[PDB]
Design a protein around this ligand. Structure first.
Ligand SMILES: [K+]
Ligand SMILES: [K+]
Ligand SMILES: [K+]
Ligand SMILES: [K+]
Ligand SMILES: [K+]
Ligand SMILES: [K+]
Ligand SMILES: [K+]
Ligand SMILES: [Mg+2]
Ligand SMILES: [Mg+2]
Ligand SMILES: [Mg+2]
Lengths: 81, 97, 120, 191, 129, 27
RNA sequence: UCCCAUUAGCUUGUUGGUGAGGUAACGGCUCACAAGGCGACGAUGGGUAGGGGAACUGAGAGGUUUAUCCCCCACACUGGUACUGAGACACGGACCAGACUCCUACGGGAGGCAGCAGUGAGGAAUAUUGGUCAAUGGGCGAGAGCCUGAACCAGCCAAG
RNA sequence: UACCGUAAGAAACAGCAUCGGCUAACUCCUGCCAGCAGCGAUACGGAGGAUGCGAGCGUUAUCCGGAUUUAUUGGGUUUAAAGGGUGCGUAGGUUGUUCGGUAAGUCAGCGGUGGAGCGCUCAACGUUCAGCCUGCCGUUGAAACUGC
RNA sequence: GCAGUAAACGAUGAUUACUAGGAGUUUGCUCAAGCUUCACAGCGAAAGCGUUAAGUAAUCCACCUGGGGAG
RNA sequence: CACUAGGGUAACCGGUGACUGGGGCUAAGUCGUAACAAGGUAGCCGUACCGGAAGGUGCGGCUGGAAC
């Protein structure tokens, strides 16, 4: 009977750093003024206990407490390689 | 502490008070946690009051001012003595008098 | 333009200039009569009385003197308001009559409040 | 403020006898001035005719107009103008003219529902009682206008002379109010 | 091609302006749905679908009075450069209810009347009157 | 195609091209 | 969640890992390998703004501006350090360093008017060195009660 | 609230040749006036009348709408301002037809959150309930269209 | 080898689909490409454009926001 | 460790300066007549050279030109 934390599904964009990865989340949303639908992307930093993620992977990450200067997410699953 | 008090929300020469639950440090007419009624001393004094919420706040321990204590003494809000299960289980009816 | 062109660039809106920039968004200013002279209109052929005044906002401008008969002179403190004269290039301000050194028009019985004359 | 000026000049300007009967309505009847028209002129004449015949100034008239617009707009503006304390007192016949009714209301002489109201612009809702003050039921001027005249030509006033009161049954329709005002002109001007 | 639906509307409009009796179109599923909607709503005389070796052909015979066409204006709304999405509560009325708007919805392709009846929204393809 | 439109453009080009020649060889 | 590309690269505890210390608490917050991270979806640098609900104003799209009012933030002549406290940018508390101003009796000391009111100057322009804690709200007190330039009022001002 | 003895103590300002509501006579014939057509007088100054508004009336300063004068709703580029000298091409934008998956856009449901009275003698104004929350978030479903 | 300008003009960007007739001309064979002037609907303020649109529509790019100062 | 204070080099934001050059408006005093008609040598665009001044000439282009 707990609360729920934020979850983000994304694509791995960098893994050159030890025990941490970068996840890119992209979505299409409506422009406020002209009403066109444009693409936007955001980059998250996630903590992975093993360097088991290569460049490009549909993954899910979950919100955590600050684990570093810029590290607030943790890996949960790998949808595909 | 959490208090039950009146904010002057009216016009010059016509005082109309709002009965709210607010911190003691907040300004008189500023911030409050919950509105629990109204009060008008100009008539012969009309009082609006949320009985359930007033009971809840006086139970969790909000301290009322003197005038708000009199307003709660009216409308029978201080019946917590009777509702404390004082060696009984029924509910008396003193509102008719 | 196309929708994507508008998304990339957008629309730009300019700012309308103020017709009385020396007032610095004030109704009236105070000045001193640096010079009092006369000018000729640009098909009128009159002799219009003007004063060059240095306002307290660190600016010098030319102010017309409306009415017939002015008691002003050089080095006189005057109140300057907006309003330009069509047939006179340059000047774009008026001097309020009946305020500070400027006196009201003598012998006025109509339009008195526009020239600072009291009820007779 | 109030007009408090010459009335025959306005009467001769507008042609109609807004204030009542006068010899100047038939002798020397022309607009005033030693020297005496666009649709703006006629609209202004109509609006000023309403204002002068009801004793209303410009800001109050505009407030009445847009109140009627909020709640045919020209049709109910006329009944809003009619529903006034001074106008109702004048139509009840207890006072000779509308200026006399306004003065009587402004002075402590008229009560509404038993309480004295001295604002001569108070809107009177239907089903309300307007009556003379019980301390002023025996004035020399107060009786000759009501008694003797006894017009009672309006099918929306109840008089009840036995109590000196009066009641408004309902707001009369635009056809039964004897005012020569084209409300279409005024609503077009203010539109 | 960029907008086949706009091309279909343009072909119909050009045939109406030229005063032809029939008009041919390279077939598509959404255009079959649109011409079915138009025929059941009473804007064209009749239609016919011919499934050939290509994607197919749609032949439309238009409706004229005893010489004014039944269709006055066709206006494409949701173009590729700017897609338009609306709900049932904010759907528009064409010619103050005397014209129709073809709308693609999760329940299918129908007009604004049927869409408001079924309480569903989607894409506004075109205004027809 | 009034003609007087191009006369102003021709005239200011002459002033610009002449102003540069006065200091071309002038070091 | 503002403009400028007549602002194109920025960063070297900067990015991450191990360990330790410190904190109410996670954390390069601090201290002793790998090298990274962020950028044409505008990093970095420069200029200008306190931010919202309100209010005004447009059929709508919206827009303008925070005059009164309410919520959040920052500040108390200018900087630095803290201390006491449940809680501190410490608004009628310190210490030190800088302007500036005032008084001594030349050995020595004081103030910060961004609390309420006089006065002067600046300006086109904005008021009493007023009364009361009677009401509402605060602080202390077992209570009575004491204090409250908050607040209630009054005075002045073509004044909406 | 009540009592005497009295209309007694209380009306200005602007503009009247067109736009605009409101015209005779005297001056001047520069002095002047103006938002524009402009007059230097049915336009300047006074006198008589007139017309607005009214304890206010005008002048100046600032901001919106008409303005579509930045145009998504809702403008244009032969000659009025406006097609790059012409191509190739990077990022980006757009994507013929059809069969299935998914659920990012899209759609729907369910939750959480953020006019009528009464009193001012009337009114501004106070105050209460019916009434929007149509912004954000969570959670269930749909698959025609866009995306994958 | 530099330079990078023009009334570098059809004063008319590229692509795709559709919509009437007359008079010629070149090539490939009555048909399809191209080449220029009169001319329906339509467009335009008008002159005019009119299947080689300045008509009907869709996609992307470039540019304009009164005249001088001033390219 | 840093608040200051001190020297020095480097930026940016600003004033002033012997002297020396554009532009706008008002006057119009002077000098010619470049454009508008085939404006009396058709006009204009680019470029180069040369003149008190508008301009002239050479080379290429256009018709927003006559006239044949
Ligand atoms: K009472
Ligand atoms: K404490
Ligand atoms: K008190
Ligand atoms: K033609
Ligand atoms: K010549
Ligand atoms: K020549
Ligand atoms: K050429
Ligand atoms: Mg008033
Ligand atoms: Mg042009
Ligand atoms: Mg070209």
């Amino acid at each position: 009977e707990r609360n729920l934390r934020k979850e983000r599904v994304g694509v791995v964009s960098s893994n050159k750093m030890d025990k941490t990865i970068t996840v890119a989340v992209k979505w299409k949303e409506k422009h406020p003024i002209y009403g066109k639908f444009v693409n936007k992307t955001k980059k998250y930093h996630a903590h992975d206990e093993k360097n088991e993620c290569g460049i490009g992977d549909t993954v899910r990450i979950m919100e955590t407490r600050p684990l570093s200067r810029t590290k607030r997410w943790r890996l949960t699953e790998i949808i595909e390689r | 502490a959490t208090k039950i008090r009146l904010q002057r929300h009216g016009r010059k020469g016509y005082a109309f008070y709002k009965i709210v639950v607010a911190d003691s440090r907040a300004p008189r007419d500023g911030k409050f946690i919950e509105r629990i009624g109204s009060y008008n001393p100009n008539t012969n004094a009309t009082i609006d009051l949320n009985f359930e919420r007033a009971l809840y706040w006086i139970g969790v321990g909000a301290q009322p001012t003197d005038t708000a204590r009199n307003i709660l003494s009216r409308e029978g809000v201080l019946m917590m003595k009777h509702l404390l299960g004082g060696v009984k289980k029924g509910a008396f009816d003193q509102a008719a008098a | 333009p196309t929708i994507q062109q508008l998304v990339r660039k957008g629309r730009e809106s300019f700012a309308d200039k103020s017709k009385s920039p020396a007032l610095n968004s004030c109704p009236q200013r105070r000045g001193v009569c640096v010079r009092v002279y006369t000018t000729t209109p640009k098909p009128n052929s009159a002799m219009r009385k003007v004063a060059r005044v240095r306002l307290t906002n660190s600016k010098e401008v030319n102010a017309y003197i409306p009415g017939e008969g002015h008691n002003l002179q050089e080095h006189s403190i005057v109140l300057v308001r907006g309003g330009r004269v069509k047939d006179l290039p340059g000047v774009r301000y008026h001097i309020v009559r009946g305020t500070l050194d400027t006196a009201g028009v003598n012998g006025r019985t109509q339009r008195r409040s526009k020239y600072g004359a009291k009820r007779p | 403020a109030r007009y408090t000026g010459p009335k025959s000049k306005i009467a001769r300007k507008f042609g109609d006898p807004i204030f009542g009967a006068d010899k100047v309505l038939s002798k020397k009847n022309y607009p005033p001035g030693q020297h005496g028209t666009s649709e703006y002129g006629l609209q202004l004449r109509e609006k000023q005719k309403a204002k002068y015949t009801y004793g209303v100034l410009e800001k109050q008239f505009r407030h009445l107009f847009h109140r009627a617009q909020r709640a045919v707009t020209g049709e109910l503006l006329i009944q809003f103008l009619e529903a006034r304390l001074d106008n109702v007192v004048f139509r009840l016949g207890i006072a000779p003219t509308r200026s006399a009714a306004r003065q009587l209301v402004s002075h402590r002489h008229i009560t509404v529902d038993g309480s004295v109201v001295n604002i001569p612009s108070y809107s009177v809702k239907p089903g309300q009682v307007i009556g003379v003050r019980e301390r002023s039921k025996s004035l020399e001027v107060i009786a000759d206008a009501l008694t003797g005249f006894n017009h009672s030509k309006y099918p929306w006033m109840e008089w009840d002379q036995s109590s000196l009161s009066g009641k408004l049954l309902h707001m009369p329709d635009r056809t039964d109010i004897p005012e020569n005002i084209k409300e279409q002109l005024i609503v077009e001007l203010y539109s | 091609m960029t907008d086949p639906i706009a091309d279909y509307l343009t072909r119909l409009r050009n045939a109406i302006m030229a005063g032809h009796r029939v008009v041919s179109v390279p077939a598509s599923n959404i255009k079959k749905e649109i011409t079915k909607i138009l025929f059941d709503k009473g804007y064209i005389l009749n239609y016919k679908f011919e499934e050939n070796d290509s994607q197919g052909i749609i032949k439309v015979a238009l409706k004229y009075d005893l010489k004014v066409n039944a269709i006055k204006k066709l206006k494409r709304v949701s173009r590729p450069g700017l897609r338009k999405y609306v709900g049932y509560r904010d759907m528009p009325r064409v010619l103050n209810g005397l014209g129709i708007a073809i709308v693609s919805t999760p329940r299918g392709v129908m007009t604004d009347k049927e869409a408001r009846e079924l309480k569903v929204g989607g894409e506004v393809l075109c205004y027809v009157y | 195609p009034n003609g007087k439109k191009r006369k102003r453009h021709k005239m200011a080009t002459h002033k610009r091209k002449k102003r540069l020649k006065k200091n071309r060889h002038k070091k």
